[PDB]
Design an enzyme around this catalytic site. Structure first.
Site: not given
Ligand code: NA
Ligand code: NA
Lengths: 214, 216
Positions: B33, B60, B62, B65, B120, B197
């Protein structure tokens, strides 16, 4: 530097076509806006090429992510040296606070930090789909107010609302607009994004001269 | 292409650190990613560099627009050849439709098109600042339903909504999740699992990955 409030949108498909327009103009007459289209195609290097050529750049990527990722994207913009960068106020106060705090270590050499409130594309129908009963301007007003609470430098908004916003939020809160370039200056606007009227004109410089002259 | 549903997040602050990690692992064991952390620093060429190493990539960024700009950004991602690309459902139904239609020229070679619903990070109090009185889980369900109506391939969501979204939206609709464990995420119906991580900062990431894949 540059005396102009005009930011010329570079929405090109191809590097050379963009730079061939950029050669025809002068950093004294405008700044340039780099959006998701050219950035996804060329990356920060295109922003550096515009920097070489003496221009200040509005990096218009509308960051909308969790606070840690937005703070790091905005800090990367500051490391790139750009003059303005924007974030979605829809990301919430913690995300904007984090974008602001990421720029404090850069001092007076940080880009201005602007929030998109409600995209100019959104009608009230679009807002119903997402559970927003208010009108586009009332919701934009609520987001602009949240943006000022978080200490950001200003918002993107319609020139129609400049009057109202400079009212509720203060003279120093920068208003960027994506109604003539004269009518808007008088009604509050600080910087003005203009695309095809400049980029599709015959003498963009003269067109630039004309808008600037007013 | 790998059979693992693991997507390892590359959130480094410099090219050399990222590549030191990526050259340790095998493209048959996971996907990668690339988000704004590394795309804003290194641009699309870093995506091409990962593809030269044989990896499939979840870009990723996002995108959120106006429709015609998102659509160009999405097509730029497909021209890059990425395996997945995402947009904010919050950009509304016309933006998502425009994103999907931007991928029609690319046929079966198109990236999977996934919509972020609620980040999240957002708690109910973060949402109320915005005029949303719905819970995060319910607001995400609303955006997820809009996403499927617009014909996108799936959504980003928590393993906690996995069972819910598979009931509501169907088995074909892809769920990408960024505490529940991998095997438990799979059991709940998660399709792809972003992991950062635990892998990138592990002692032996080759070994940490292998343990993850083993449980799946
Ligand atoms: Na998210
Ligand atoms: Na806008």
């Amino acid at each position: 530097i540059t005396s102009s409030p005009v930011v010329v949108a570079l929405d090109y498909d191809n590097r050379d076509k963009a730079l061939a327009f950029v050669e025809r103009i002068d950093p004294r007459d405008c700044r340039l806006k780099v959006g998701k289209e050219m950035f996804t195609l060329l990356g920060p290097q295109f922003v550096r090429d515009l920097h070489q050529r003496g221009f200040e750049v509005f990096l218009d990527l509308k960051f909308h992510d969790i606070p840690n990722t937005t703070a790091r994207a905005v800090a990367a913009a500051a490391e790139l040296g750009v003059w303005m960068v924007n974030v979605h106020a829809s990301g919430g106060a913690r995300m904007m606070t984090a974008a602001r705090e990421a720029l404090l270590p850069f001092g007076k050499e940080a880009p201005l930090l602007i929030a998109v409130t409600v995209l100019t594309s959104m009608e009230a129908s679009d807002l119903q789909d997402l559970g927003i009963m208010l009108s586009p301007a009332d919701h934009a007003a609520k987001l602009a107010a949240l943006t000022k609470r978080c200490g950001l430098d200003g918002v993107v908004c319609s020139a129609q609302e400049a009057v109202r916003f400079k009212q509720e939020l203060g003279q120093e809160f920068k208003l960027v607009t994506p109604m003539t370039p004269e009518q808007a200056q008088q009604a509050g606007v600080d910087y003005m994004v203009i695309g095809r009227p400049v980029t599709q004109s015959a003498d963009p410089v003269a067109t630039l001269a004309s808008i600037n002259a007013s």
